[PDB]
């Protein structure tokens, strides 16, 4: 659907275009990402957080990015790299009041609808639309369902969540049933990131090859 998420970020539009998108600070673990300490807005352990509304992300910047003259609130389209943190971590969600939606891998540049500017903690009335934004593609897409994230929860190997529903039925080998659990959570996330990035390259590089004219 055409839904949209929101993220305060110190990094300006030009650096984001240069990096290919909104990248995380490679460890991939959703639990560590979510409980990570927050001078810059949650982008640790292989993920980058966002918020459900434009007003809840503005507030997020106005605590974390207090002491920044200028930051940005990037408006992001929803795609199946996003995970609802409260849905995937259940009662063990460390900061449930934040209503997080974390992009495993980052938010590619095509996924970024645009960005508001913020000066001395005041929002810009209007949006800077992104020339690389893809409205049709990303509007036929949605957040990943919680079932895709339960196996990527990233709970410690002997956490009680791994012997509890829904997580037992998605639990990586070594997680409640050597670093087997830790290495598998990493690799299952590296695979999920690899297959999502495969799918976006399918979308964008196929368009770049809608060039071809066999007959000519």
């Amino acid at each position: 659907n055409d839904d949209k998420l929101y993220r305060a970020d110190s990094r300006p539009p030009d650096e984001i275009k240069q990096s290919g998108g909104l990248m995380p600070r490679m460890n991939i673990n959703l639990y560590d990402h979510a409980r990570g300490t927050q001078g810059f807005v949650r982008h640790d352990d292989g993920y980058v957080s966002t918020s459900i509304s434009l007003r809840s992300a503005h507030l997020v910047g106005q605590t974390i990015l207090s002491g920044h003259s200028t930051y940005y609130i990037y408006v992001i389209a929803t795609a199946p790299n996003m995970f609802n943190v409260n849905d995937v971590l259940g009662a063990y969600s460390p900061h449930p009041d934040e209503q997080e939606v974390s992009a495993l891998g980052g938010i590619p540049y095509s996924q970024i609808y645009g960005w508001y500017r913020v000066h001395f903690g005041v929002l810009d009335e209007q949006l800077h639309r992104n020339r690389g934004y893809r409205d049709r593609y990303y509007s036929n897409l949605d957040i990943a369902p919680a079932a895709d994230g339960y196996g990527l929860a990233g709970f410690p190997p002997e956490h009680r969540a791994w012997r509890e529903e829904p997580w037992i039925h998605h639990a990586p080998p070594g997680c409640g049933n050597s670093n087997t659990c830790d290495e598998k959570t990493q690799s299952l996330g590296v695979k999920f990131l690899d297959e999502y990035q495969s799918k976006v390259k399918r979308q964008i590089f196929s368009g770049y090859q809608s060039d071809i004219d066999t007959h000519n």
Partner: protein, 103 residues
């Protein structure tokens, strides 16, 4: 001149409009002798073909056959929604005469 696919399609006998509003499920392609052709499917089992260039096709049609195989391959890969296909139903699989793509 027709302004859309439905009206273009109705100029031709033994055609019919298929309204799918879905991305192509699978794309097949062959270079085997006498079978230099393409074949798409959709979720629901619907199967269609770009015909082998033969005796039913004029020269301007052979150019556009090669183009349709380009369009269809790349439309499959982009996962573009296909509104409608005008097809010929005197063949099996139904042979594509036109396609329209839209959100």
């Amino acid at each position: 001149t027709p302004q859309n696919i439905t009206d273009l399609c109705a100029e031709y006998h033994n055609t019919q409009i298929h309204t799918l509003n879905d991305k192509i499920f699978s794309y097949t392609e062959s270079l085997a002798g006498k079978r230099e052709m393409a074949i798409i499917t959709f979720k629901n089992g619907a199967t269609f073909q770009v015909e082998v260039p033969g005796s039913q096709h004029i020269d301007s049609q052979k150019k556009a056959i090669e183009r349709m195989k380009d369009t269809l391959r790349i439309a499959y890969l982009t996962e573009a929604k296909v509104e409608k296909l005008c097809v010929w139903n005197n063949k099996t699989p139904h042979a594509i005469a036109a396609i329209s793509m839209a959100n």
